[PDB]
Structure formats: C-alpha cells, structure tokens
Amino acid sequence: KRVKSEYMRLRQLKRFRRADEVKSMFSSNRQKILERTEILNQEWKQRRIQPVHILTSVSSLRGTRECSVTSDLDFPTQVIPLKTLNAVASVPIMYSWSPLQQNFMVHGDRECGFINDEIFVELVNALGQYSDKIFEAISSMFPDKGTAEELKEKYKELTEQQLPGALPPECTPNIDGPNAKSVQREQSLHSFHTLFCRRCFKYDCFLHFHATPNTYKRKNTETALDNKPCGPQCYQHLEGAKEFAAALTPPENVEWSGAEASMFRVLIGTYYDNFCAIARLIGTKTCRQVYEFRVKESSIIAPAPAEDVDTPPRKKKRKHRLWAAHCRKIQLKKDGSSNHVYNYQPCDHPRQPCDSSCPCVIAQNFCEKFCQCSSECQNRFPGCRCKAQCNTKQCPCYLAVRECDPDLCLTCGAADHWDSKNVSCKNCSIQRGSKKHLLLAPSDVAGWGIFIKDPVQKNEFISEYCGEIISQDEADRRGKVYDKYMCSFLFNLNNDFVVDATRKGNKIRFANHSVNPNCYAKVMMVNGDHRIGIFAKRAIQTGEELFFDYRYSQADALKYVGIEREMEIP
Amino acid sequence: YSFKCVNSLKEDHNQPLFGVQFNWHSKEGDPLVFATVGSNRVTLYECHSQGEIRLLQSYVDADADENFYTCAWTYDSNTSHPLLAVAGSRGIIRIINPITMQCIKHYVGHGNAINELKFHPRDPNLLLSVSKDHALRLWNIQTDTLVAIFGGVEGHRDEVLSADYDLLGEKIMSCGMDHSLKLWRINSKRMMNAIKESYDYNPNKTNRPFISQKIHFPDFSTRDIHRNYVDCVRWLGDLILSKSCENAIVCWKPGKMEDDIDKIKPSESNVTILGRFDYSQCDIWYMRFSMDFWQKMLALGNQVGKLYVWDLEVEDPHKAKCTTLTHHKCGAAIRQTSFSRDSSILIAVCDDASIWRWDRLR
Amino acid sequence: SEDEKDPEWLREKTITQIEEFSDVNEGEKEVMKLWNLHVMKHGFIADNQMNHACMLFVENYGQKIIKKNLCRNFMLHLVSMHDFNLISIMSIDKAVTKLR
Amino acid sequence: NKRRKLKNKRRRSLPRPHDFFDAQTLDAIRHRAICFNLS
Ligand SMILES: Nc1ncnc2c1ncn2[C@@H]1O[C@H](CSCC[C@H](N)C(=O)O)[C@@H](O)[C@H]1O
Numbered sequence A: 001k002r003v004k005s006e007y008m009r010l011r012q013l014k015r016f017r018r019a020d021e022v023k024s025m026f027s028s029n030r031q032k033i034l035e036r037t038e039i040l041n042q043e044w045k046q047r048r049i050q051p052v053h054i055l056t057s058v059s060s061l062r063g064t065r066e067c068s069v070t071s072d073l074d075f076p077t078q079v080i081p082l083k084t085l086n087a088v089a090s091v092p093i094m095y096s097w098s099p100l101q102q103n104f105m106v107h108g109d110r111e112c113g114f115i116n117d118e119i120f121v122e123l124v125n126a127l128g129q130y131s132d133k134i135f136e137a138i139s140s141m142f143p144d145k146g147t148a149e150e151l152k153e154k155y156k157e158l159t160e161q162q163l164p165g166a167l168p169p170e171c172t173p174n175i176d177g178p179n180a181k182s183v184q185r186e187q188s189l190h191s192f193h194t195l196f197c198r199r200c201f202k203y204d205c206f207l208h209f210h211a212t213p214n215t216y217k218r219k220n221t222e223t224a225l226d227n228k229p230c231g232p233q234c235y236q237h238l239e240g241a242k243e244f245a246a247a248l249t250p251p252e253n254v255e256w257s258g259a260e261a262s263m264f265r266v267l268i269g270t271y272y273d274n275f276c277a278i279a280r281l282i283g284t285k286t287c288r289q290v291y292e293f294r295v296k297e298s299s300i301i302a303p304a305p306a307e308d309v310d311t312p313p314r315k316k317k318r319k320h321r322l323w324a325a326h327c328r329k330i331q332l333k334k335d336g337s338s339n340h341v342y343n344y345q346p347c348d349h350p351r352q353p354c355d356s357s358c359p360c361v362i363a364q365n366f367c368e369k370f371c372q373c374s375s376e377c378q379n380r381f382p383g384c385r386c387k388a389q390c391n392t393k394q395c396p397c398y399l400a401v402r403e404c405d406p407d408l409c410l411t412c413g414a415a416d417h418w419d420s421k422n423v424s425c426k427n428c429s430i431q432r433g434s435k436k437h438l439l440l441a442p443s444d445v446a447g448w449g450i451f452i453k454d455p456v457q458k459n460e461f462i463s464e465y466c467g468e469i470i471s472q473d474e475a476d477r478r479g480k481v482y483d484k485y486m487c488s489f490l491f492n493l494n495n496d497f498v499v500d501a502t503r504k505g506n507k508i509r510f511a512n513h514s515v516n517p518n519c520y521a522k523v524m525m526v527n528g529d530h531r532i533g534i535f536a537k538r539a540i541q542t543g544e545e546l547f548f549d550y551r552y553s554q555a556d557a558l559k560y561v562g563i564e565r566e567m568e569i570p
Numbered sequence B: 001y002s003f004k005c006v007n008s009l010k011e012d013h014n015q016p017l018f019g020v021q022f023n024w025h026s027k028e029g030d031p032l033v034f035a036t037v038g039s040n041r042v043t044l045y046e047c048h049s050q051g052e053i054r055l056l057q058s059y060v061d062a063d064a065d066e067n068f069y070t071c072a073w074t075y076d077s078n079t080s081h082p083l084l085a086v087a088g089s090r091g092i093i094r095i096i097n098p099i100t101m102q103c104i105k106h107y108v109g110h111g112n113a114i115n116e117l118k119f120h121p122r123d124p125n126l127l128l129s130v131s132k133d134h135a136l137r138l139w140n141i142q143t144d145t146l147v148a149i150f151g152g153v154e155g156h157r158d159e160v161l162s163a164d165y166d167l168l169g170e171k172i173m174s175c176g177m178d179h180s181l182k183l184w185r186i187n188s189k190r191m192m193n194a195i196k197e198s199y200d201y202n203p204n205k206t207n208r209p210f211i212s213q214k215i216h217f218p219d220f221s222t223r224d225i226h227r228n229y230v231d232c233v234r235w236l237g238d239l240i241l242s243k244s245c246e247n248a249i250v251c252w253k254p255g256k257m258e259d260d261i262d263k264i265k266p267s268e269s270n271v272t273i274l275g276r277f278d279y280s281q282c283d284i285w286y287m288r289f290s291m292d293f294w295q296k297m298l299a300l301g302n303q304v305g306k307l308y309v310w311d312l313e314v315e316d317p318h319k320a321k322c323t324t325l326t327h328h329k330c331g332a333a334i335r336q337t338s339f340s341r342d343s344s345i346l347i348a349v350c351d352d353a354s355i356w357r358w359d360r361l362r
Numbered sequence C: 001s002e003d004e005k006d007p008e009w010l011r012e013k014t015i016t017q018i019e020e021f022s023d024v025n026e027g028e029k030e031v032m033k034l035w036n037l038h039v040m041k042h043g044f045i046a047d048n049q050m051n052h053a054c055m056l057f058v059e060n061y062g063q064k065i066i067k068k069n070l071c072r073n074f075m076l077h078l079v080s081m082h083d084f085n086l087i088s089i090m091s092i093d094k095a096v097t098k099l100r
Numbered sequence D: 001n002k003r004r005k006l007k008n009k010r011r012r013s014l015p016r017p018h019d020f021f022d023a024q025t026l027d028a029i030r031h032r033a034i035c036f037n038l039s
Helices: A002-046 A117-128 A132-141 A148-158 A185-195 A239-247 A258-271 A275-281 A291-300 A320-335 A472-483 A554-560 B189-198 C008-020 C026-042 C047-068 C071-083 C089-099 D023-038
Strands: A066-071 A078-081 A103-105 A438-442 A448-452 A467-471 A497-500 A519-526 A529-536 B003-007 B020-022 B033-037 B041-047 B053-055 B068-075 B082-088 B093-097 B102-107 B114-119 B126-131 B136-140 B145-150 B160-165 B171-176 B181-185 B230-232 B239-244 B249-254 B271-273 B297-300 B308-311 B334-339 B345-350 B355-360
Touching (some): A002 A132, A132 A148, A185 C026, A239 A291, A258 C071, A472 A497, B020 B334, B020 B345, B114 B160, B160 B230, B297 B334, C026 C071, C047 C071, C047 C089, C071 C089
Parallel strands (some): A103 A467
Antiparallel strands (some): A467 A497, A519 A529, B020 B033, B041 B053, B068 B082, B093 B102, B114 B126, B171 B181, B239 B249
C-alpha cells in the first residue's frame, strides 16, 4: 500500500497546503467581516429608530376579522384583529425580452474534466526517482504504463514545454504597429477577407461566403496614366527612368521598412503602374525610390497579369421575355409545387455556366447579384422598371416575392434619396424600414396587445416581424418547450427556417389573433433575405386593435386562439 | 450550538408560512420586533423574556388572493419610522409603516412573481426585487423613480430566485433554477450617476420620463457549482456561499484562490471551491437559512424539522463540526429561519403556520 | 418611438464578440469596431451609400484615426472594398486628404 | 351604420375589466350603515 500512500501523499502535498491557505483567507475575510460589521453597526447606532406601537381598535370597522395566534407551548393564545391591505391593480403577465430591429442567427457532474496533468507531473516525479518493479509501481498508480521505455514517451510529452497560444502564429502585427512584418499582399487581406461579409457589408455579420475572396477578374487599364514630372523625383524627371518605366509596363539610400515593403506589395496589386499615387499614399518616400523600388520589386517578383475582357454579348439579344421562358420552365418543373421555399444561397460558377447544376437553379430561385453567376446569368433578376410605383399587380416585383431592389426600381426612386423617408414606391419600405408608431396595451382578448397610433388605409406597409434565425428541428424542441405553457413565438419563415421572437424581437410580437383580421401576414424576399411583413387588410383609423390570422390547424386554433370576441348580428 | 427551543406559537390560518424578518434596523434598547409573511396575512411579533412572545399588529391581504413570498425590513430617515416591504406571487410591492399602520407606496411592473427582497446595506431607499420573469429591477422608493434593470438580453434564461448584497453594497450575486451564478458590480462608474440622478427627478420637470438603465453583462457567470436547483447564496465577505437541493452547502470564490474578487474580468470562468458544509433530509428547494448579525453563526432548518448549525469562525469545512439541534415537536417543514440583531434569539418557522423560537443557552 | 436604427446592448455585444477573435491584432480590431458601429448607426444598404459612407466615416472619425494612430490598417481595410468593388480610387484619395 | 343594433354586440368571453371598489371601504360602509341603523 506504499505506492498508494506515495500517490496519496503526493496528492496530499497540495491538499494540506490548500488547508493551510484556506484558513488564511478564512481569517482575512473574518477580520474584514469584523471591520465592516462594526462600521455599519456604528451607523446603525447613529440612525435613531422609533420603537413600535401596538394595534388599537378602530370604531368604524368593528366588523373586521380577528385572528388568534395559537401557542404551541403553554402560553396563552393572543388575539389581534385583521386589517385589509391596500388595493393595487394588476398588469398582464409578460416575459422578459430585448428590442431587435433585424434578424440574428444562433451538467454539473464531474470535476475539472481531465485527469490532472499535475498528477502526471507528480507521476513524472516517480519517473525521476528511478528496476522493473519501479516500472510497474509507476505504471500501477497513474493510468499510464510508465516503464523506462515509457519514461521516454512521458519525457517526450514533457518536452513540449510551451504552446503557440490563441494568436496569429505568424508575425502579423497591425501595419500601424512598428513590429509589422514584410507580409505579402495576400496574407494581410486574409484577416480582412475572412472576417468581412459583403451580403451585409460588415465584418462578422450576424445574419450570414468563405468559398472565395474577391477572385473575380477586373479591368486594370481604366487608369489615365498621365505620367508627368509631378513628383519632383519620380518615374518622370528622368528620361532613362521614364523610358525604363514604360518598358517595364537603383533606389536611393532611403531604405524600405518591412512594413513599408509589406504594403508596397499591396499597392502594386492595386495599380501595377501608379507609382505617383503609391508615393502619394507612401509619404515615407517620394515618387522616386518608389518607382525604383517598384523596379526592384518587379525585378524580383513576377509581373502582374493585368488582363481585361469584354465578353461576346454587348447589347440587345437579351429580351426579357426570354427570361419569362426560363422561369416558365422553372415553374413547370419544380416551382409548380409552391411549397418548397428555400433560403437564398450564393451559387458559385467560377468556370461552369449557370447550368441546371446551379445551386440557385436547383433551389428553384433566382441567382442574386451576390452569386458568382456572371453579369450574363439568365437566372438573375432583370430590373424592376415600374414607372409609377413598383407597387401594384402590374409591378412584376410586386407580383414577385422580391422587393424591388434599390439598384433596380430606378423608376420608383428606390435608389433615389436613400436618406429620405418618402418615395414614390410602396414596395421599397422594408429596406428603408419606414415602420409605423405603435402602442402597447393590455388586449381585450388576452393579456397584452398592440394598438396603432395613427389611421392607415388598405395594403399599407406596417412594422416588420423581427426575430432570431433558428432551424426547423430546434424550432420543434423550443416549440416542444413552448406548448407546455401555451406560448407561441415561432413563425414558419420558409420551408427551411422558423423565426422566433421569444427572447429577441420588436413590439409587434404581442399581436393577437383573429379569424377576421384587419391585418394579414405576407412573406417577402429582400436582398436574398427572407422576411415577413404585415399589412392592413382594410383601411384603419386611429386607436385600432390589430389582429392577424396565426394560421394553425383548426384543432390547434381552438387549442390556443379559441377566443373570437364576436356577437352574431343575424 | 448553545441553543434550545424555549417558545413556539402557531398561526390559526394553517396556511403555509414564508419569509421571516427580524428588525435589525433598530436602536440599542428598542423592543425586539420581528415580522413574518404568510399566504395573505402579514404578522409581526416581539420576543420577550421567560419564553413569552407578544403578538403585535397583524394584517391580511383580503383583496389580493395571492401567497406572499418575500419581505424586508424598511426604515425612513425623514420620519425616523421603520417599515417593512412585502411581496408575493402577484409581483406587487407593498411597504407598510407600523407608525402609519398602512402602506402608501405602490410599485408594480414585474412580470409574473417576486421571489427575493433585500435592501442596500447603506442606502435604505434602494431595493432589489428578483422576479419570475428573470428580471432584476431597481427602485428609488425615496424618489419613487425606477433605477437600472439587470438581466435582459444576456441575463438568466431561467427564473432567478436568490440574490444577495455584499457587505458594502458593491457587487450583487444572482442565482436561479438555471443554476447560473451572475454578479454585477454596483461600483460601475455609470450606475451611481443614475443613482444620483435617480434622486434628482421631477415628474413635472419635463414630459420625458426617467430613464432607468439596462444591463446584460455580468462581471462573471458559471453553472458548474450545482447540478440541481440553487436557492441559497450569501456574501460571506469576499467569499460566496451556495446551497442547492442536493443536500450540500458549498462556499467558493472566483477564479483561483489568489484571484481578487474585484479584479475578476467578465470573461473569467474559473472557480475555486472551498465549502463542504453538507446536509441531508432537505432535498427540496425553497428553503432559506438565517445568519447572525455579526456573521459568526450559521443555522439552517430541515424539511424533517431538525436544525443544521455551524459557526463562521476558524471552524472550516476541513472537518465541518456540525451542530444538529432538533426539537421533536417540529417535524413538518422548516420553511425559514431568522436570527435577531444578535446571536441570542433564533426563531424557526415551520410550514404548517407554526413557529418555534430557540433561545441561546449561553 | 422607443425605437431607432440600433439598440445600445447590441453595440456592447458585438464589441465583446470582436475581442474573442485571437488572430486579429488590436490595431485592426478597433478598425471594424468604429466602422461597424458606424454602420448600424446609419444602416446604409446601397453601393452609392457605401461610397458615401466612406467620406462620411473618415469625416467623423479621421481625427480619431490619428488619435488611435491606426491609419495604415485603415487604408488596407479600404483596399478590401476596392477589391470588393465598393470603392473607387478617387475615394481612396479622399481618405488621404481627410486624414492629412 | 344604419343596421347598427344595440350596444351588446361586443364579445362572448373576455378577461374581467377589474372592479374599482375595494374591500376595506366596503366593511367601513357596512359598519357605518350598521351603526346608522342602530339609531
Ligand atoms: N385570440 C386568442 N385567444 C386566446 N389566446 C391567444 C389568442 N391569440 C394569441 N393567443 C395566445 O397568445 C400567445 C401569443 S404571444 C401573445 C400573448 C397575448 N397577446 C397576451 O398578452 O396575453 C400564443 O401562445 C397564444 O396561445
């Protein structure tokens, strides 16, 4: 039992030193208890306190009830009359939540999890204290097999001695930081490109891409290239320097820092020729020794591609009725089902055409401008040119589930005055979020409800139904949890997702249910994002209560929203 | 340890009994008054010698048919009159002045119910009412204006029922059925600005109502302490007590044992467990213990009606030399306990409308 | 209204989530903090707005860029958009003028 | 609306709108009434 005792005493070494320690801050807290308790006691001494007074009879209320607190012991039972407390009104029940104007995607057993590595270090002490009997004594207590041949393996795991840690392992400080390395053009943008998300053009978007960086080919000859002696010392001001620059389409003693050389590697990738603008950006060097070091860099590194294309199609031959054929195809094969609504996904076709293999095509949905399908893809939307307002049955975009994009319905001013609030269009509001003002009040039907502040007409935009993104299967689980207390905050956004407003959302989540509502729900497509809005089923005046059909099953409707609040006139 | 039952009274309503309160907000020589909340009745008593207890003025909520849950002694500096706030299942706060015999401060706004009441140790005009909707709201009763609210978007995803002030009122621990341990620092530069502004408000000053604040980011959180519901945590100075239904009481400090409580960042997740004052026969929650005024003596009741008693001296969970006091006549359910402003008088309350006073045998 | 472009708590949560990232140096980390907090402050949605946001963001915080001395990281952060076609060359020139 | 019937056309079952009266005033009125009948 000596090996267990050695193992126990090795474990005991930190055990009793803990006991020695705990006694210390036991004492240190105790004195802090004594200091503070006395201090507050002193102030309690300062605060004069009125002694209590006993109850007295009230003549006007002799009808009040009397209670006799029975004594469990021999003591007599004492009697003092009751008294009715003050009355206070009560408000409808409601659970906590947080405001939200967009959409957001989303024990107690064992100790410390892992077998303690310090005990391994305690086991290492068993390795150092070391013939065969020692090997198994080492191997018996700890789960390992610590024979001398295994001593080396444990020594091998000891030789790690350090961890790289949660940091960029490569020396990649911020360029503004003096320690920035001469990092190439690509590696620096890696952090930016990975974190950024263009679909909401924010870094680490909360509603979204990693497939490719901006690998698309772009024109490079759009520069004016008026190479003139404008940089005192430049590619110009010297015919030899200028002629050498043109043919390539020694730097002075002013050296280049690694950070300077690093973003020098970036600036060439932007212009490939604009030493002056590079010099304008790089105040550390004049245009000379920028062009010269560009010569030095271009001599060392491979020359840039600098390629431009124009594509065979130029104009016409793209009558939109041809697009009408394509969606007619899409409607006849798959979209005739009208039930499999898929969230948009950016299809990628680096060299493939927008064939039937297109993810958007198989998803029965148009390719968005975010897709890698080129500017000639036939699955993209054509442009929403409704002259008066992109807002009616003649508006294909209104006929579509897609809100007329700001860059498309140029005739309804969707792009015009994005800062301004009033536009000719009506089917552009959700982008601008021209929500109406609402009021919160206890609904007549059940608990809290929503009331509108101002009169509105039929089919007028109202506030969005914000929430959080959650998958269907978990919506079952949360919904499974929801039915145990008759809650409902899950909305079937599409065939693939359900939105929840239980924890995050805006005020509209408290809207009640009615079978004959003044408002109705309508899914919509916005910038590749599925959203649901509400519109007035009829014209509405000031102070109305709002309703819409939750559209569950008939049996489900009786289960939750059975209240109808209607008298029969006939 | 030096204690015995000397008195026991039972209320005639036979309703389950709830939070006890002894008026530690008194003066030297004042009558020793304590209060207790029943289902809808509220009763006050004063301990007396020989084992006698004189029933004091008692009221009943004959209008709100709800079970009162929590209460806290109150004091007014202006009139020097003590009071005592109450709360229950309907989530409404009433504060009765015994001098006024009545409550004239009405405060509503919590969602479902109130399960905790405690005042600021220094300012008697600040109160935390932990609620059923996971909400942590603060009221400036002196100005009747609301103060910052805690929880919200990143608060407890389950009902909180237990919270505590520290001795100086700088950090507030919070724990609920989610077994989460979230605390917030009062001393946060923003808050006392609002607290000062909470005392600086006029409804007639402007149409704009007072702007209470919102918090969602505790200075620390964890759940590893208990695998069952937690209902009893207290500020043992810089150390934190914690009790669950699993028949154990554990004390612990954030991070490592050398880590300052006030230096701990919100990103911290480490724990230092140094408490083993375990118990038994009390596998159900909604039981609350009591503390002496000087933080030197811990007494906890039992469902089977016994007592679990320990001191806060150098006696430590290294051995946990318990004192299991027991009265045979009380065995139904010890709902709560309450010390006096000393260590001489202990009042144990059973669920079946019966109380059991234990006096120190020193 | 009780409602606006962007709630306060959301600003706090996103800033905290930024610090979680380890591969990002603090020079960059501050860059999107200011730039992002600029975004849902105004909620731009168009490419034209994207450019207009550029001189707008530099106009408001160009001095703060000097104060943080995180300019060089900010030019690179600009170049990405020019790679993403949301930025033109003369737009980059505008930032240089605003900075200096 | 010409066919507007009586005011009863509201609802079938809705939450109670909460009574304005109170209990402790009710007892005081009763005892005031009781002592009123005593004379
Ligand atoms: N017409 C209706 N009658 C009864 N319950 C309804 C209802 N419409 C909605 N509900 C209930 O309300 C929940 C939606 S959240 C809205 C709650 C309700 N307006 C209140 O403040 O009390 C659903 O879980 C549903 O069960």
